Amino acid sequence: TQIGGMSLDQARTQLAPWTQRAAPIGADEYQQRIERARVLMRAQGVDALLIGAGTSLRYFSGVPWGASERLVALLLTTEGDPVLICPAFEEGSLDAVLQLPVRKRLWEEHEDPYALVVQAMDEQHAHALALDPGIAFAVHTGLRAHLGTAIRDAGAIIDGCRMCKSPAELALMQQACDMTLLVQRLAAGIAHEGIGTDQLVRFIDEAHRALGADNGSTFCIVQFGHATAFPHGIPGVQHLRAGELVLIDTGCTVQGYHSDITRTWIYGTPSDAQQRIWELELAAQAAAFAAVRPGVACEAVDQAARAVLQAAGLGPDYRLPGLPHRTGHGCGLAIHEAPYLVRGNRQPLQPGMCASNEPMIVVPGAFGVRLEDHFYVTDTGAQWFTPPSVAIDQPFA
Amino acid sequence: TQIGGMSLDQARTQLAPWTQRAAPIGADEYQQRIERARVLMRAQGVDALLIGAGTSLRYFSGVPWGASERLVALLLTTEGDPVLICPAFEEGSLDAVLQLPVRKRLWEEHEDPYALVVQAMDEQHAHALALDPGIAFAVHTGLRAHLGTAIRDAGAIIDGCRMCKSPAELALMQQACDMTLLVQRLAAGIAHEGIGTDQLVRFIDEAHRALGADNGSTFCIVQFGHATAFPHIPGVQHLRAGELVLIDTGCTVQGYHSDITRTWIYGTPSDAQQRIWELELAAQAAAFAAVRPGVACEAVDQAARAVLQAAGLGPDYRLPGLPHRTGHGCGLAIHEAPYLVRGNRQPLQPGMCASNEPMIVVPGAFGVRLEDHFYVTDTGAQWFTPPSVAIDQPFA
Ligand SMILES: [Mn+2]
Ligand SMILES: [Mn+2]
Ligand SMILES: [Mn+2]
Ligand SMILES: [Mn+2]
């Protein structure tokens, strides 16, 4: 009963704005983030940290703008309000989004914003910069015109803050996930013979927007039939036929925090091969989840999924039929962030880490099945953000 | 009569799929871009170039994927097919979009892709790498772990290719602009008392899709009244008689961007609105009249500012006036070199494409932004779209 048979206007009747709205991040929590960054800076022997516009700037300062060709950055040192380097003409706009007190250092269009970063270093006798790994390489070129000391990669400091989510972060993420899960549910409901992949993408966007996501669908992949064999798809619109699997991978943000959920379900009657692979995928996902608790190396969670596949005669390693990519990724303010659930990653799981659990099986020439739900690590184990699917024709628990 | 009076029904009658479709970029032109990069690399003493996923990888290879945490890159050396560094699991999906013959070098999830880059360098005896300045700093870290030699910034090489558009690229951008102009005109026509900023966003997207844009609207800003003085925090507004409307939108066609702003009055304008609107047009016109081969980009920005100063606004970036640059290059990116900004000595040359948008802000009152792009010709410039005629005639 979850697949097909829902009219567009029936689905529409389940799309009122979401009424269980998590609290934004508070001022105190931004100070705690700065404080934690300072601990990790000192641990690494760094005395200044430069964070570019994008997910990390939003994390530390609230500023949500996307990166551009104009340097917008926070420069954190071991004391005092961090410096916010920003185009002069954007000052009014910056003041309206900041969640953290800052010392603003503004540059007019022809002025060199990298000189301002280094001047603010020199003012506090800081000579050991770490730079945001997400920032454009052009920024290392700019800083090099003025800085002669070693520039360290800030990834350890940034991850060491962001990997473990606070309760407020978890609730924002949960909201986003509950919204997208509903959207997934309605998309499965309106599916019918002949529906276009593009029509389902457009519905999903409309539906996330109606529920009050920040900005509709963050992304959306919809594939039918043989196209499901490509983990990230191929160009081209498809039209649905009985007997095909349907893989829908989509998500939204709520105050920048992501959902990221995949469902793969049959439309019509499945073959034995489809059933067999779908069950195996549910089982691989379930084994990865059972492996999660504090102290467990991230690679062990990936190993747990591959062990199920290999005991069914798939794999080993990335061999196809099997799992050609890692089991999962971290999620937060970015879709993909630390920690990664991947072979070779010894990083121990800690309470509050969030990650995907999406051990997709690909059968070359045929189809793929990806079941994707995220979890967070609790004090004694893990918790699903969204409950896994139940069957090939029952995508929703 | 450009503004208002049109039904949604009438607008839809002008929304058949675009029939004058510009040719996609062909296999030979990708090879010419690779060749062009190679001479630039030789001119600058560089023997290896790494391009990351994004507009530059698309330019060189046709791969359109946005950058992610996994290295997807093209490594170009002084000879042989370029090397495409890619996750192994994405190989099938990479093959469906590649437009250039490459030597694929695939890595499994636990393997170090930066190692592959350096091994490909070492096989060619390349030791003088330039790195895409748009790529994440993480890639510098990854490469530096394997290299003792300098990692140069590739921006001279990449801009030396991308800034001057081929005829094929100009035609694709022309298509994108012609479609977006129509959308702008329809949006003006359907505007009425009460209409939502959100309803206009939605219609704009629908229209861009109906005409055959790559993916609807690329972006859409719609501002009414006092909000036009705040060019950068969204919020839904409803239209009233006496308000300015500013609509900034664009699409892509084979990834080539349009980016057009129109600002017009709904109802009767005040004398201040009229005077600033006229000034905006004049500033835009003076910038365009400055464009010709060998003019410095900053001379084009100064030409706009001179208009505003002669009329008593400014000076410099002071308001009421022009608080930021006059315009930006445009291509596969909305914003790319060359920038029409004070301090930029870069001389314009034939084929360069940029925006001309010397917005006037009157603080706390309103703003008027007129935005049309141009390309540089052998003797002067050519508008992709013709400028507005009047505060109540947004379309020439
Ligand atoms: Mn995922
Ligand atoms: Mn996903
Ligand atoms: Mn624009
Ligand atoms: Mn523009």
What is the distance in angstroms between the Cα of A73 and the nearest Cα belonging to chain B? 14
Residue given tokens 């989510």 in the structure block: A165
For B122, counting Cβ atoms within 10 Å of its Cβ (0-12 exposed, 13-18 middle, 19+ buried), the class is exposed
Which residues are registered as beta bridge partners of A328? Answer: A341
* Beta strands at B151-153 and B73-77: parallel, antiparallel or unpaired: unpaired
Cα gap A203→B220, rounded to integer Å: 19
Of A89, A133, A337, the CB nearest to B317: A89
Closest residue of chain B to A94, computed from CA coordinates:
B232
What is the distance in angstroms between the Cα of B135 and the nearest Cα belonging to chain A? 6
Let me know: does A203 contact A185? Beta carbons within 8 Å. Answer: no
Sign of CA dihedral A329, B68, A163, A45: positive
Q: Which two tokens stand for residue B72?
A: 């997807």
Sign of CA dihedral B97, B103, B104, B110: negative
Is the CB of B324 inside 8 Å of chain A's CB atoms?
Answer: yes
DSSP single-letter state for residue A146: T
Cα gap A303→A282, rounded to integer Å: 15
Let me know: does B37 contact B157? Beta carbons within 8 Å. Answer: yes
Which residues are registered as beta bridge partners of B152? Answer: B130
Q: Which two tokens stand for residue B340?
A: 């029409």
Task: Determine, for residues B69 and A336 on separate chains, whether the beta-carbon distance falls below 8 Å.
Answer: yes
Cα separation values, B365 from A91, B196, B247, B273, B371, Å: 17, 20, 17, 9, 20
Cα gap B390→B290, rounded to integer Å: 22
Closest residue of chain A to B67, computed from CA coordinates:
A134
Cα gap B225→B46, rounded to integer Å: 52
Entry resolution (Å): 1.9
Number of Cβ pairs < 8 A linking chain A and chain B: 104
Cα gap B353→B333, rounded to integer Å: 11
Q: Of A230, A356, A362, A380, give the one whose Cα is nearest residue A302.
A: A356
Q: Which two tokens stand for residue A268?
A: 């019509």
Cα separation values, B121 from B44, B111, B146, Å: 17, 18, 11
Task: Determine, for residues A230 and B97 on separate chains, whether the beta-carbon distance falls below 8 Å.
Answer: no
Sign of CA dihedral B266, B268, B271, B275: positive
Cα gap A304→A292, rounded to integer Å: 10
* Beta strands at B129-131 and B48-52: parallel, antiparallel or unpaired: parallel
- What residues of B are designated binding site for Zn(2+)? 69, 90, 232, 248, 259, 328, 335, 357, 371
Is the CB of B342 inside 8 Å of chain A's CB atoms?
Answer: yes
Task: Determine, for residues A109 and B325 on separate chains, whether the beta-carbon distance falls below 8 Å.
Answer: yes
Of B87, B155, B343, the CB nearest to A138: B155
Which chain A residues are within 8 Å of B137, Cβ to Cβ? 131-137, 139-140, 153
Cβ neighbours of residue B344 closer than 8 Å, sequence gap 6 or more: B296, B297, B298, B301, B338
Single-letter amino acid code for the residue at B118: V
Helices marked H in chain A: 8-12, 27-44, 55-61, 91-97, 113-123, 138-144, 155-162, 167-190, 197-211, 272-290, 298-311
Tell me how far the alpha carbon of residue B270 is from its chain's centroid: 33
Q: Which two tokens stand for residue B31?
A: 């090879």
Of B89, B135, B233, the CB nearest to A325: B89
State phi, psi for A372 to the nearest 5 degrees: -130, 115
How many residues are listed for chain B in this entry?
Answer: 396
Sign of CA dihedral B11, B16, B22, B27: positive
Q: Of B245, B140, B139, B133, give the one whose Cα is nearest residue B189.
A: B245
Single-letter amino acid code for the residue at B90: E
Helices marked H in chain B: 8-13, 27-43, 55-61, 91-97, 113-123, 137-144, 155-162, 167-190, 197-211, 271-289, 297-310
Closest residue of chain A to B337, computed from CA coordinates:
A69
Of A110, A141, A235, the CB nearest to B97: A235
Using alpha carbons only, give the angle A264, A268, A269 rounded to the nearest 5 degrees. 95
Is the CB of A342 inside 8 Å of chain B's CB atoms?
Answer: yes
* Beta strands at B327-329 and B336-340: parallel, antiparallel or unpaired: antiparallel
Let me know: does B352 contact B329? Beta carbons within 8 Å. Answer: yes
Q: Which two tokens stand for residue B221?
A: 């800003």
User: How crowded is residue A204: how many other Cβ atoms within 10 Å of its Cβ?
Assistant: 24
Which one of the ligands is nearest to A329 CA? 1
Residue given tokens 């390309």 in the structure block: B375
Let me know: does B194 contact B78? Beta carbons within 8 Å. Answer: no
For helices B137-144 and B113-123, give the axis angle rounded to 10 degrees. 60
Which chain A residues are within 8 Å of B131, Cβ to Cβ? 137
Q: Which two tokens stand for residue A19?
A: 């009424």
What is the distance in angstroms between the Cα of A28 and the nearest Cα belonging to chain B? 23
Is the CB of B153 inside 8 Å of chain A's CB atoms?
Answer: yes
DSSP single-letter state for residue A47: S
Task: Determine, for residues A324 and B135 on separate chains, whether the beta-carbon distance falls below 8 Å.
Answer: no
User: How crowded is residue A80: how many other Cβ atoms within 10 Å of its Cβ?
Assistant: 11
Cα gap B60→A259, rounded to integer Å: 33
Is the CB of A98 inside 8 Å of chain B's CB atoms?
Answer: no
Cα separation values, A67 from A72, A138, B335, B390, Å: 8, 12, 12, 35
Ligand 3 centroid to residue B286 C-alpha, Å: 19
Return residues 162-181 of B near A (CB < 8 Å): none
Q: Of B248, B251, B246, give the one whose Cα is nearest residue B260.
A: B248
Characterize B292-324 residue by residue with b for buried, 16 or more Cβ atoms within 10 angstroms of its Cβ, and e for exposed.
Answer: bbebbbbbbbbbbbbbbbebebbeebebbbbbb
Cα gap B91→B220, rounded to integer Å: 34
In order of start, what are the domains of chain B with their CATH numbers?
A: 1-162 (3.40.350.10), 163-396 (3.90.230.10)
Ligand 3 centroid to residue A179 C-alpha, Å: 32
Let me know: does B155 contact B340? Beta carbons within 8 Å. Answer: no
Cα gap B354→B284, rounded to integer Å: 12
Cα separation values, A392 from A249, A273, A330, A385, Å: 16, 12, 26, 20
Coil, helix or strand at residue B29: helix
User: How crowded is residue B134: how many other Cβ atoms within 10 Å of its Cβ?
Assistant: 23
Cβ neighbours of residue A366 closer than 8 Å, sequence gap 6 or more: A226, A229, A273
Task: Determine, for residues B134 and A136 on separate chains, whether the beta-carbon distance falls below 8 Å.
Answer: yes
Task: Determine, for residues B342 and A110 on separate chains, whether the beta-carbon distance falls below 8 Å.
Answer: yes
Which residues are registered as beta bridge partners of B220? Answer: B249
Helix, strand, coil shares of chain B, percent, nearest 5, are 35, 20, 40
Task: Determine, for residues B138 and A153 on separate chains, whether the beta-carbon distance falls below 8 Å.
Answer: yes
State phi, psi for A347 to the nearest 5 degrees: -55, 120
Single-letter amino acid code for the residue at B321: G
Q: Of B355, B13, B387, B11, give the one whose Cα is nearest residue B188.
A: B11
Ligand 4 centroid to residue B231 C-alpha, Å: 12
Let me know: does A337 contact A354? Beta carbons within 8 Å. Answer: no
Which one of the ligands is nearest to B373 CA? 4
Cα gap A359→B291, rounded to integer Å: 56
Task: Determine, for residues A137 and B132 on separate chains, whether the beta-carbon distance falls below 8 Å.
Answer: yes
